[PDB]
Design a protein around this ligand. Structure first.
Ligand SMILES: Cc1cc2nc3c(=O)[nH]c(=O)nc-3n(C[C@H](O)[C@H](O)[C@H](O)COP(=O)(O)OP(=O)(O)OC[C@H]3O[C@@H](n4cnc5c(N)ncnc54)[C@H](O)[C@@H]3O)c2cc1C
Ligand SMILES: Cc1cc2nc3c(=O)[nH]c(=O)nc-3n(C[C@H](O)[C@H](O)[C@H](O)COP(=O)(O)OP(=O)(O)OC[C@H]3O[C@@H](n4cnc5c(N)ncnc54)[C@H](O)[C@@H]3O)c2cc1C
Ligand SMILES: CCC/C=C/C/C=C/CCCCCCCC(=O)O[C@H](COC(=O)CCCCCCCCCCCCCC)COP(=O)(O)OCCN
Ligand SMILES: CCC/C=C/C/C=C/CCCCCCCC(=O)O[C@H](COC(=O)CCCCCCCCCCCCCC)COP(=O)(O)OCCN
Ligand SMILES: CN1CCC=C1c1ccc(O)nc1
Ligand SMILES: CN1CCC=C1c1ccc(O)nc1
Ligand SMILES: CN1CCC[C@H]1c1ccc(O)nc1
Ligand SMILES: CN1CCC[C@H]1c1ccc(O)nc1
Lengths: 425, 425
């Protein structure tokens, strides 16, 4: 038996397990898959032999992401911008300017007012309390309805929606306004910062940092899928798809939220959690690496295409690059390569698509989702509760961070809070 | 005797007198000077024979200034932009961009936050109540102190202060933050709009519109300076520097605020008004027309010089132009032409100054001031009261508009309110 079992080997489980062990605890980490890192997954390009790519989480910003910055400093892990962005190829209409901030003068007053309105609204959110605890329900409505109330003219309306589509991984009609404002709050009450947090990347991949942390975890089992967590007796029992059980005074759940409905909890989780756990969150982000020929370097495109964003990622050669596109998996089928070409050529009619690469996170039984985003109405009913302990079972992860949800930073934040709960218990 | 005597023939007195007469009232208008229009003064250039210039009020914006827009429509008075602005020559440091909005990306987050803060603060102001009636005293502090609290980086800090210097006609240390926020509120709660209201000019001069309105006023006396207004008996008596008195059921004071201390009121004005009336407001705006050679057309400059702004005004020839500079008369002596050249060359080192033109509003006994701006502490003590009736004496004018102070629009607004008070009395 262990002081703690940590279930899931993403950044959240890795941090918890490491920190617990360093506190002198006896810790077991169980990972269902064949690798550690979870939604941070660097690996070889399917399109370009020998090229390492981020198929999930990649971008960070030291100022918004201080826990992560500490990890990088701790291990001397090198980072950089993926690219300098210099060529803008927007589809925002004939008045937009081809710059990173493409809003023309004629829209300045509208932007100014919308800035005030969005930030006023975001300032309603106290990040320690939970979105269900603050009379915020009037904001928990479809994003498109919220944005209609701003009455933005066309460049800025489409700019805002495009980035919002990108960032939440939902179309405007499925996204919660309140959740947008949450991301705004997380970035020190900044609209701009939501997109400026795409600031650097792992020079050598997210695996650089996954490997550093796991070197400090003495006991890891891969290919071990937890199917049951039972705290009816004095010590927690964790059953596994094909193994003995393992036992611990404490269990940390660090698997993705949309997988919890597959674990049998004994006794059942508190009832107010159960419905949202069953439904799952509504995130359908879809990040597609696109192998292309004839693209200039430094391209960024934002606009009204089925790819809201498309931007530079890495040089493959003098004539070939990878771009990255975000959309959502409910709106777009990445295996429809005819579709990919259309989506690309919309922004970049001169470019040829050579191939694509992505991971179907939503179909993957270890995930059942990309990054968190609530369905409308979800998180004003229950939010903070999802990441509270139930008896001796803790819930951590990005998905449930109040402070930086959907980011690597949020995995780290939640782990911190669990480690501490467990040390003071 | 008259139904109404209107004292002062600026836009405020002209509107009142006209509207009253059209309501069937018997009205006398008394103007101290040799012309109608007051601080709207178009006349021949002192530097360029045959050229008509605005030596005071010139700029308008139909959307912010609807009463004025109505006057223009009423009389078919033509307007236009003075110039298209295309060349920017800022002194805001090495990071600024040479555009109308010169803020670089590195300052975007700071601007965003400052936008929120300024507008939140401005939204504290209800425009119908008076600045002394709203617990606003914490904002009534020196602008530079307020701005220090925003902690803006250099481009945006200097940009904001420059325009604020221009617009209030006071240096930051003498200007009230609360008054800045007032102008922000007046422009439909917009920072940007304060400067975007420089939208058009009178094609033929402000006199175009002064002459149209005065054609509808049957009785005007020029060169008649009011020295006394006495409502101790049943009918108001108005004494004049060298004339009979004139008598009226009602008297409208439409002279500038800083001249009221020269009129003997009987009985004395309510005591809470008296101190600010005695002190005067603190506006020291100074608008200088600068005759130049070797300037390209379309120049706008903003920066940290003793001229915060300098911009295009009119073509004189293929090689000569007038620019306009704003500063303040406490900081700058316009009769020091060596000073003018230095101030110009700071922005435009290639240009020769040929001459200058301005009106010393502050020395002029019919004015004792340019446009209104309160001393710090003034208008949180008394504001709305200054433009309320005292018995049968009304106080109108730009200086005392709650809705658009310091603009032509405010003269029109106040006149409207008096005419109406008098019709319902
Ligand atoms: C496409 C995409 C792009 C992203 N981009 C960024 C980005 O740029 N920047 C950023 O900061 N974040 C990004 N993210 C979000 C970020 O990657 C994740 O939020 C974060 O990595 C999640 O860490 P975690 O430890 O909460 O969960 P995960 O990393 O999901 O870890 C959960 C672990 O649990 C395992 N598991 C599941 N079920 C079981 C079971 N029953 N038993 C045992 N183990 C199980 C999984 O295999 C996994 O290893 C991105 C995510 C995606 C999907
Ligand atoms: C340099 C400068 C630039 C400006 N630029 C703009 C601008 O671009 N746009 C804008 O909208 N506004 C501008 N203004 C502000 C605007 O011009 C004035 O606020 C507005 O014209 C004032 O109108 P009024 O009728 O309140 O007062 P005034 O126009 O001042 O009228 C007062 C009248 O009273 C007369 N008078 C004084 N004492 C007596 C006395 N005892 N008896 C009889 N008559 C007396 C004066 O001769 C004068 O005619 C500017 C002002 C200045 C000084
Ligand atoms: C009393 C104090 C007054 C303070 C005034 C400060 C603001 C004055 C700004 C006046 C200039 C505005 C010009 C707009 C741009 C333009 O016309 O022409 C544009 C300028 O391009 C732009 O970059 C506009 C970007 C929009 C920014 C909106 C941000 C709102 C935040 C408010 C700012 C807060 C103030 C600073 C603290 C050039 O081509 P086009 O682009 O059209 O294609
Ligand atoms: C979840 C929803 C997210 C919505 C995101 C919308 C905002 C995303 C913007 C991301 C791009 C920002 C780039 C900044 C410019 C840059 O880096 O590089 C600059 C861009 O130049 C600019 O025009 C910046 C002007 C500053 C504007 C500040 C206004 C704040 C208002 C907030 C906007 C509200 C959002 C719209 C409704 C180019 O050279 P340089 O100029 O440096 O010299
Ligand atoms: C260049 N811009 C403007 C807004 C966001 C970006 C951006 C996008 C991708 C990346 O790697 N870095 C920056
Ligand atoms: C061009 N800009 C940017 C901010 C203010 C102006 C401006 C100045 C003078 C004028 O006549 N019109 C516009
Ligand atoms: C940084 N966010 C957190 C979750 C998804 C991720 C992300 C990264 C790049 C991009 O363009 N959009 C979103
Ligand atoms: C429009 N405002 C009202 C009072 C002074 C005037 C003004 C006009 C032009 C300029 O550059 N600054 C200020």
């Amino acid at each position: 038996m262990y002081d703690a079992i940590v279930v899931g080997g993403g950044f959240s489980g890795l941090k918890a397990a490491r920190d617990l062990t360093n506190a002198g605890k006896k810790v077991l980490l169980l990972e269902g898959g064949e690798r550690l890192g979870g939604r941070a997954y660097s690996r070889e390009s399917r399109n370009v032999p020998g090229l390492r790519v981020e198929i999930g989480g990649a971008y960070l910003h030291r100022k918004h992401h201080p826990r992560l910055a500490a990890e990088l400093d701790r291990y001397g892990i090198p980072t950089a911008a993926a690219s300098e962005f210099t060529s803008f190829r927007h589809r925002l209409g004939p008045t937009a300017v081809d710059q990173a901030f493409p809003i023309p003068g004629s829209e300045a007053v509208a932007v100014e007012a919308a800035t005030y309105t969005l930030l006023r609204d975001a300032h309603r959110i106290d990040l320690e309390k939970g979105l269900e605890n603050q009379d915020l329900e009037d904001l928990d409505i479809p994003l498109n309805e919220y944005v209609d109330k701003l009455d933005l003219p066309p460049v800025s309306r489409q700019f805002l929606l495009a980035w919002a589509w990108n960032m939440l991984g939902q179309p405007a009609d499925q996204a919660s306004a309140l959740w947008m404002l949450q991301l705004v709050a997380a970035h020190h009450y900044s609209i701009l910062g939501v997109v400026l947090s795409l600031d650097e990347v792992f020079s050598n991949g997210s695996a650089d940092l996954v490997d550093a942390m796991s070197q400090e975890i003495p006991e890891i089992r891969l290919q071990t899928v937890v199917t049951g967590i039972d705290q009816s007796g004095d010590v927690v029992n964790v059953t596994v798809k094909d193994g003995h059980a393992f036992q611990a005074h404490s269990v940390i759940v660090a698997t993705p939220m949309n997988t919890w409905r597959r674990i049998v909890f004994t006794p059942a989780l508190p009832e107010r959690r159960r419905s949202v756990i069953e439904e799952g969150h509504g995130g359908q982000g879809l990040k597609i690496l696109i192998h292309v020929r004839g693209a200039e370097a430094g391209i960024e495109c934002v606009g009204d295409g089925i790819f809201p964003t498309l931007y530079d990622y890495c040089e493959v050669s003098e004539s070939e690059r990878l771009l990255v596109a975000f959309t959502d998996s409910g709106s777009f089928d990445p295996t429809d390569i005819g579709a990919v070409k259309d989506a690309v050529l919309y922004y970049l009619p001169e470019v040829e698509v050579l191939g694509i690469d992505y991971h179907d996170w939503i179909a993957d039984p270890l995930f059942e989702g990309p990054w968190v985003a609530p369905r409308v109405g979800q998180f004003s009913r229950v939010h903070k509760e999802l990441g509270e302990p139930a008896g001796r079972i803790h819930f951590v992860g990005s998905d449930v961070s109040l402070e930086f949800p959907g980011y690597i930073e949020g995995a780290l934040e939640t782990a911190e809070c669990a480690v501490n709960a467990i040390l003071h218990s």
